[PDB]
């Protein structure tokens, strides 16, 4: 580990200090279908004509990034993804820009979101969940080893590849930080007590989000939910959590320390950090090197009818991409 991260940290720092830009153009890909939309961009299934490959292209409306005050965040995402390298992180193949947009072309993961299978299946058996948690746990050791905080863990951001392993998407809040940070960001159900309380926080929030993940994965529902965000925040800071009857004793214990309101008593952010997690009972059967190597038998393999297939993604209204004749936000996105 300490040996692994060492090398890893050095390759990231090189790209970090020398990010690559303009490695492709829009005309080299074939726009085929929208797979996800949102606030200021959308992801499209695209086809690279020269290699005949399929990729997930993330298109950011520059003016929209600006009105939502997400400039620095967007720069964070691209700069960080062009430099990280781990098996549970989707790869940033190309990144470029034109008059109106920012583009991040990455590997296409046809398996679909963990969210869909989860909601469709209802809830995962503990083993199947631990197999996913483990992957998040390792990936978080990687990111954190590099001073990165992820900040948006949740089923929606987890894709399942062919081998059945996790692929983390969306680094819109990923940030390289040594020290406290104060940006309020994330998704309601997963917010840490610290964040909601606007009290300056650290990596400990990713570990809390992990606790929420494991629980939803294993309960079928979130540990804190209500129809309105404020309602949800009241449960989050309450320091109270209930667990289904099927939850194993160990799982309740591992979770009691993960969802620890007091971040000076929360697993992950202790003197042993990660290990307090990796050496936990619920994980006692986990073979980490095995998991990091993908040699572990996957709980379930997604059904893919082939490359370019999108039957594991919901449909979405289409819209023609438009690039104005004039540059829209030159200076703001200069380094992208």
């Amino acid at each position: 580990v300490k040996e692994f991260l060492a090398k890893a940290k050095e390759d990231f720092l090189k790209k970090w200090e020398n990010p690559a830009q303009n490695t492709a153009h829009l005309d080299q890909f074939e726009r085929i279908k929208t797979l996800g939309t949102g606030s200021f961009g959308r992801v499209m299934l695209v086809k690279h004509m020269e290699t005949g490959n399929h990729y997930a292209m993330k298109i950011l409306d520059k003016q929209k990034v600006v009105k939502l005050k997400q400039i620095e965040h967007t720069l964070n995402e691209k700069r960080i993804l062009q430099a990280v390298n781990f098996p549970f992180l989707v790869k940033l193949e190309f990144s470029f820009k034109d008059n109106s947009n920012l583009y991040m072309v990455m590997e296409y993961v046809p398996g679909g979101e963990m969210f869909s299978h989860l909601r469709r299946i209802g809830r995962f058996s503990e083993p199947h969940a631990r197999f996913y948690a483990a992957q998040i746990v390792l990936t978080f050791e990687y990111l954190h080893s590099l001073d990165l905080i992820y900040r948006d863990l949740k089923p929606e951001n987890l894709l399942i590849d062919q081998q059945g392993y996790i692929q983390v998407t969306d680094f819109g809040f990923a940030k390289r930080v040594k020290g406290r940070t104060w940006t309020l960001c994330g998704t309601p159900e997963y917010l840490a007590p610290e964040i909601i309380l606007s009290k300056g926080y650290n990596k400990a929030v990713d570990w809390w989000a992990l606790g929420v993940l494991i629980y939803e994965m294993a309960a079928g529902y979130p540990p804190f939910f209500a129809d309105q965000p404020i309602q949800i925040y009241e449960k989050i800071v309450s320091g109270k959590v209930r667990f289904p009857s099927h939850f194993s004793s160990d799982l309740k214990d591992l979770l009691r320390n993960l969802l620890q309101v007091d971040l000076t008593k929360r697993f992950g952010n202790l003197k042993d950090g990660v290990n307090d997690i990796k050496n936990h009972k619920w994980f006692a059967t986990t073979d980490w090197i095995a998991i990091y190597q993908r040699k572990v038998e996957a709980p379930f393999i997604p059904k893919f009818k082939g490359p370019g297939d999108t039957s594991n993604f919901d449909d979405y209204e289409e819209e023609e991409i438009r690039v104005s004749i004039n540059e829209k936000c030159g200076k703001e996105f200069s380094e992208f």
């Binding site: 948006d152 809040f173 960001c185 159900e189 309960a219 129809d227 965000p229």
Partner: peptide, 20 residues
């Protein structure tokens, strides 16, 4: 049941991120 209250709750779809 908690599972039922969740299914009947308006929060079972893809949840949007917040910040501002």
């Amino acid at each position: 049941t908690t599972y039922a209250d969740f299914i009947a709750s308006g929060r079972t779809g893809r949840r949007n991120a917040i910040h501002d």
